[PDB]
């Protein structure tokens, strides 16, 4: 009981250090306890921030310095 | 010789026998050399036609008669309105065939000589080697000289014919650049002058430059850069300058070792300008700036800067110096003994914006060279106060903004030069141009590093002006980044913190753009908002509720949809 | 049992909403005091500000801060004012005339 108490205090600290009280109670209002599997079903659980970040391949191909020297425009062309 | 202006009885012998073909050619040559009877020779019929006919199929067994191809049609080719008649007989076409044939024959001769330079194992001064070799060697000279003469004059004709763009296009379509690069291998001053001049004329075009890119041309110009001829060096340098507009050729120049040679040309000659231009083009690439400090003599470049007495420093030298000042390794060489001191003294005496650009580039670096600037803060601040145009003031402001020395006293500097109202006035909506406003912002950020100035910045009203400027410049990433950095500087001073938090809505702007598309803006905003986390408990609540709402914005809008 | 129930509830919400980075940050900043028997935190600006941040070199990728006005004026105007380096605009060496007129 003591160890789980310590880690639930840790978890309390986490949620108080990031989630405000209004959002905490809203999230509590939008959660459900289902017995067949025995878990907390969160409405629209897939569209939370962590899954959205996992869905975004942020790393992209940046280009070379837009301020490079390219003096080849000075060369003429025939006709 | 004895050749009267009449022109018959000499062309009659021009198509009757082979030993006397050359005699008639030389007799006509004597006349063609005088421009007064050139017209009479021109209106002469069945005379130039016979010359072209004899040229067409009797040049492969003459060489001496092949000096009627040119020196006659070269004489006609020195004047433009005759060119058309020269192209009526297609004489420019035969010149290319002759040049290619001679180049191939020279390669065959060189291969034969190299084969005959293989029996050096035992010396016997007989048919084995040495003696006989010497014989053929002499023969080689006795031929090559003559051939070279032909090449020279033939090329000259083509050069004169290249003054027309169409004819130059026809020449390049027949691989003239390949012939010129091959001819670069010879050892003859006048022929090399002609070839390099032809190449410099051709290289202004993109396709000719691309042709001489694949046929490596810099490797054949390095062997001629330190040459003892004066005109050859000049024309080779002009060709190098024309070629230095291409990145690949520029990279090749440093691989073949052209930097030390070009800087030796920079000492004191008639090639300071062109060598400096080529070096300037080389130094626009960042990895080549460092190698100018590596033995490359840049001390001499300071001497040219200090001795050059005029109101303005020449643009080539100052541009090259500005480019060199962007490297810290070069900056250590510039600021050795007394180098920054003299540069600063000169730029203060004569208001040179370009010299001030060089000084700003020097000040951008964060070694002891930055600590060398403590004696010039007041000197720059004197010029900052809107006296010397705007190109000189902007560089002084930029240099002063670069002095991020952690224990510098800005309070006295601001007190005497009364530079704080000027900085405030430059934050007005229509005060000055955007670059000056940005450098004013960087000034404010640098000044905020000192705690003693904090109170001075609180009562001045700079913070609301910066907020208005951030509102007006919300579409510029640089402006918003620098303003937020100013805020980050002026939070931890206990006097501008109160204005930032309690009096202004700057944290509201910081919240609204914390997750910007720009990494720098995000980093500065995040670091600023950790300072405001503890000094205000309501702003911490806002910084939490925001970015939790934003982090999961879709999950909070999914109720609506 | 309801205790472990609320445990797994808060685990679920932490997994969905709280970012990983801030999560490990607040673990590294947490400290369990036995005397008061609870978890406490640490400040931020008092811990840092020894290594005060250096000014961003440029928000647009340049060598120095560069306004949009200077970007537009750099592309059209040849004035050196808007450029940190490469202030010279050299041109090609045009060929000379070899032929006379007479």
Author numbering:
A (entry chain A): 580 to 658
B (entry chain C): 129 to 689
C (entry chain B): 574 to 675
Give me lines lifted from the publication on this model.
Heterotrimeric kinesin-2 (KIF3/KAP3 in mammals) is one of the most widely expressed and abundant kinesins functioning as a complex of heterodimeric KIF3 motor (KIF3A/KIF3B or KIF3A/KIF3C) and the armadillo repeat (ARM)–containing adaptor KAP3 (16–18). Notably, the tumor suppressor protein adenomatous polyposis coli (APC) has been identified as a KIF3/KAP3 cargo involved in RNA and vehicle transport crucial for neurons, accounting for ~12% of KIF3-associated organelles. Here, we present high-resolution cryo–electron microscopy structures of the heterotrimeric kinesin-2 complex (KIF3A/KIF3B/KAP3) bound to the cargo protein APC. Our findings reveal a previously uncharacterized KIF3 tail hook-like motif, termed the “HAC” domain, which mediates binding to both KAP3 adaptor and APC cargo.
To understand how the KIF3 tail interacts with KAP3, we determined the high-resolution structure of the KIF3A/B/KAP3 cargo-binding domain (herein referred to as ABK) by collecting an extensive cryo-EM dataset. The final model resolved the core region of the ternary complex, encompassing KIF3A (residues 574 to 658), KIF3B (residues 580 to 675), and KAP3 ARM domain (residues 129 to 689). The reconstructed structure revealed four interaction interfaces between KIF3 and KAP3, including two tripartite interfaces involving both KIF3A and KIF3B (herein referred to as ABK interfaces 1 and 2) and two additional interfaces specific to KIF3B-KAP3 interactions (herein referred to as BK interfaces 1 and 2). At the proximal tail region, adjacent to the stalk, both KIF3A and KIF3B form a helix–beta-hairpin–helix (herein referred to as H-βh-H) motif, which interacts with the C-terminal region of KAP3, constituting ABK interface 1. Within ABK interface 1, the highly conserved C-terminal helix of KAP3 binds to this hydrophobic pocket, primarily through hydrophobic and aromatic interactions with KIF3A. Following the formation of the ABK interface 1, the KIF3 tail extends further to establish a secondary binding interface, ABK interface 2, with the concave surface of the KAP3 mid-region. KIF3A engages in ABK interface 2 by forming a 310-helix, anchoring to KAP3 with five hydrogen bonds. Meanwhile, the proximal segment of KIF3B tail adopts both a 310-helix and an α helix, where a cluster of seven positively charged residues (Arg637, His642, Arg644, Arg654, Arg656, Glu658, and Asp666) facilitates electrostatic interactions with the negatively charged surface of KAP3. Beyond ABK interfaces 1 and 2, KIF3B engages in two additional binding interfaces absent in KIF3A: BK interface 1, a 10-residue segment following the H-βh-H motif in KIF3B interacts with the dorsal surface of KAP3; and BK interface 2, a five-residue extension from the distal KIF3B tail interacts with the N-terminal region of KAP3. The molecular dynamics (MD)–based binding free energy analysis revealed that KIF3A and KIF3B contribute ~28 and ~72%, respectively, to the overall interaction with KAP3.
